[PDB]
Curated annotation (Swiss-Prot):
It is found in: Cell membrane; Early endosome membrane; Recycling endosome membrane; Nucleus. The lineage of its organism: Eukaryota, Metazoa, Chordata, Craniata, Vertebrata. Ubiquitinated; STUB1 likely mediates polyubiquitination of PD-L1/CD274 triggering its degradation. Ubiquitinated by MARCHF8; leading to degradation. Deubiquitinated by USP22; leading to stabilization. Belongs to the immunoglobulin superfamily. BTN/MOG family. This is Programmed cell death 1 ligand 1. Interacts with PDCD1. Interacts (via transmembrane domain) with CMTM4 and CMTM6. Interacts with (phosphorylated) STAT3; promoting nuclear translocation. Interacts with CD80. It comes from the Eukaryota. GO terms for biological process: adaptive immune response; cell surface receptor signaling pathway; cellular response to lipopolysaccharide; immune response; negative regulation of activated T cell proliferation; negative regulation of CD4-positive, alpha-beta T cell proliferation; negative regulation of CD8-positive, alpha-beta T cell activation; negative regulation of interleukin-10 production. Residues 2-110 form the Ig-like V-type domain. Keywords: Adaptive immunity, Cell membrane, Disulfide bond, Endosome, Glycoprotein, Immunity, Immunoglobulin domain, Membrane, Nucleus, Receptor, Repeat, Secreted, Signal, Transmembrane, Transmembrane helix, Ubl conjugation. Induction: Up-regulated on T- and B-cells, dendritic cells, keratinocytes and monocytes after LPS and IFNG activation. Up-regulated in B-cells activated by surface Ig cross-linking. The gene is CD274.
Length: 116
C-alpha cells in the first residue's frame, strides 16, 4: 500500500529563522508529474497546491505569500519538502502533508515557535 513517511513529526524552530519540513513518498525509477498531486496546509490555510506540475498562487493563503516554496530539486528523490522563511509566531501549529501519487496517504507535523 502507498505510504507517506516523515523523519520528524515535531519541529522546534527559533523566531526569525528558516525551517524546512520534510515529507517523503516512494518514487520508483522516475517522477511522472502528470500523476503527482502535493498539498500542504495548516489549520485551514492553503500553503501549497501542486496539481500535475502546476501551482496556483491565487488560492494560496495571504499569510504564506512570498514566504513558502516547494523545493522541486527533491521531488525526483521522493521528497516534497516545504520551506517557510522568517518564521513567526503565527506559523506554529499542526501541518498536514497530503500526497497523491499512485495511491494516497497523509501525515502530521507539529511546529513549535520559541518566543523572541
Amino acid at each position: 500500500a502507498f505510504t507517506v513517511t516523515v523523519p520528524k513529526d515535531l519541529y522546534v524552530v527559533e523566531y526569525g529563522s528558516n525551517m524546512t519540513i520534510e515529507c517523503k513518498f516512494p518514487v520508483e525509477k522516475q517522477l511522472d508529474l502528470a500523476a503527482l498531486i502535493v498539498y500542504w496546509e495548516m489549520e485551514d490555510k492553503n500553503i501549497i497546491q501542486f496539481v500535475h506540475g502546476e501551482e496556483d498562487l491565487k488560492v494560496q493563503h495571504s499569510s504564506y505569500r512570498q514566504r513558502a516554496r516547494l523545493l522541486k530539486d527533491q521531488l525526483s528523490l521522493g521528497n516534497a519538502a516545504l520551506q517557510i522563511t522568517d518564521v513567526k509566531l503565527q506559523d506554529a501549529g499542526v501541518y498536514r502533508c497530503m500526497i497523491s501519487y499512485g495511491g494516497a496517504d497523509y501525515k502530521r507535523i507539529t511546529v513549535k515557535v520559541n518566543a523572541p
